[PDB]
Amino acid sequence: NMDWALFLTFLAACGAPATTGALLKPDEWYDNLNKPWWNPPRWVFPLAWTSLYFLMSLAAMRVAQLEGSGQALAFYAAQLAFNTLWTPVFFGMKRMATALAVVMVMWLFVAATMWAFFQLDTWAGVLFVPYLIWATATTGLNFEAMRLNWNRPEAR
Amino acid sequence: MDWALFLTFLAACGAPATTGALLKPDEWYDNLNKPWWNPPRWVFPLAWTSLYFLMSLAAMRVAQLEGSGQALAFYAAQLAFNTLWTPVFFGMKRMATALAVVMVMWLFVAATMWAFFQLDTWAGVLFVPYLIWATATTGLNFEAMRLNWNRPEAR
Numbered sequence: 001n002m003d004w005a006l007f008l009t010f011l012a013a014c015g016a017p018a019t020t021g022a023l024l025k026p027d028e029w030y031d032n033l034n035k036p037w038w039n040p041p042r043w044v045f046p047l048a049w050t051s052l053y054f055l056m057s058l059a060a061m062r063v064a065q066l067e068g069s070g071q072a073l074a075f076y077a078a079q080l081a082f083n084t085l086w087t088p089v090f091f092g093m094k095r096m097a098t099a100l101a102v103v104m105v106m107w108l109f110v111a112a113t114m115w116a117f118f119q120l121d122t123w124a125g126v127l128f129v130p131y132l133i134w135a136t137a138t139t140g141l142n143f144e145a146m147r148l149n150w151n152r153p154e155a156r
Numbered sequence: 157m158d159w160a161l162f163l164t165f166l167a168a169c170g171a172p173a174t175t176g177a178l179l180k181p182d183e184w185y186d187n188l189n190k191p192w193w194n195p196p197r198w199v200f201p202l203a204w205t206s207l208y209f210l211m212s213l214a215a216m217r218v219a220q221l222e223g224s225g226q227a228l229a230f231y232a233a234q235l236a237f238n239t240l241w242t243p244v245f246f247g248m249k250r251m252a253t254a255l256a257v258v259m260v261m262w263l264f265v266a267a268t269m270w271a272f273f274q275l276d277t278w279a280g281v282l283f284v285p286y287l288i289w290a291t292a293t294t295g296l297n298f299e300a301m302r303l304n305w306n307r308p309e310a311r
């Protein structure tokens with residue numbers, strides 16, 4: 001069942017997006033943004049991502065042990081990279097429209113991963129379902145951020 | 157050659173490539189203190205674009221083989237820290253944090269190369285220029301750190 005080398009490798013890989021969160025805190029810029037009613041409080045985000053880093057690593061560990069797992073892991077690498085990209089674009093460069101491009105691509109690769117993961121191992125795909133829900137929420141949130149604050153210069 | 161695989165990896169490379177097209181070296185990079193052996197800015201896009209193709213071809217080869225899990229897990233890891241680095245160095249402009257990131261990148265680039273050799277020799281060979289380049293980047297990043305140690309970028 002449990003391969004600790006794989007798991008600790010995928011976990012370590014989450015250390016890159018985890019770092020973007022830890023270096024780019026929400027400050028006053030993010031405060032004064034018009035946000036949608038359903039916008040979760042600050043503390044929700046670190047919690048959610050921390051869980052998902054563990055859930056997706058565990059997922060990728062199961063899959064990586066199976067044969068024919070190349071396309072799935074290629075989808076996985078892709079998802080992780082655009083996930084690492086999103087926070088430095090939204091909070092770092094503060095380009096909400098661009099970040100929305102990024103997060104939508106993130107979404108497609110999260111989805112492609114989930115699918116490819118289901119076709120090899122049902123629990124692995126199951127482990128990515130809460131990932132796909134949070135990614136959708138995030139995209140919605142990125143979208144409302146862009147639209148409700150369109151006339152500011154950070155919406156580009 | 158497996159086109160589905162290759163294009164997937166090349167698309168993954170779109171994430172670090174975006175970082176670099178969006179954070180083009182301007183006045184700040186120009187006025188940074190840099191070693192004599194710092195290359196002209198036009199080298200950087202050429203080198204990375206080459207390596208995106210090379211690393212994706214390498215990943216295509218490996219991912220077609222039985223037992224590639226761990227190798228591909230190294231690959232996801234190096235790719236992620238690759239993507240983290242340019243926003244830390246150029247965006248945030250934090251030279252010492254950038255050094256830490258690039259050193260972690262280099263480790264995973266070396267582990268990937270290593271794991272690639274254990275499966276597919278040409279996949280390993282393809283990761284050799286990537287590793288040479290990662291070493292030079294680490295050197296460049298180290299030098300910029302110490303040469304600007306007394307400026308706010310020593311962060």
Ligand SMILES: CCCCCCCC/C=C/CCCCCCCC(=O)OC[C@H](O)CO
Pocket residue numbers: 163164166167169170172173174175176177200201202204205208209242
């Ligand atoms: C469906 C798509 C299939 C795949 C086809 C699309 C591939 C997207 C990326 C390819 C890399 C090509 C090189 C892009 C140019 C990068 C130049 C750049 O500025 O790099 C910055 C540097 O890498 C920062 O560290």
Ligand SMILES: CCCCCCCC/C=C/CCCCCCCC(=O)OC[C@H](O)CO
Pocket residue numbers: 176192193194195196200201204242292293296
């Ligand atoms: C997004 C970009 C990130 C990557 C950027 C960091 C990597 C650059 C380090 C390469 C060292 C090259 C070795 C030295 C090459 C010969 C010396 C030379 O460049 O001299 C310049 C000449 O004076 C003028 O034409």
Ligand SMILES: CCCCCCCC/C=C\CCCCCCCC(=O)OC[C@H](O)CO
Pocket residue numbers: 008009011012014015017018019020021022045046049050053054087
């Ligand atoms: C062989 C390799 C062995 C390596 C040994 C294992 C190292 C694992 C380290 C990272 C854990 C990452 C878990 C996440 C912890 C912090 C999450 C976080 O802070 O990120 C939230 C951010 O807001 C979102 O963008």
Ligand SMILES: CCCCCCCC/C=C\CCCCCCCC(=O)OC[C@H](O)CO
Pocket residue numbers: 012015252253254256260263264310311
């Ligand atoms: C291949 C295995 C990779 C597995 C994952 C690797 C984990 C490395 C563990 C510790 C890194 C600690 C390095 C910390 C670097 C110092 C950061 C620094 O720059 O601190 C300055 C800051 O600005 C102060 O204000």
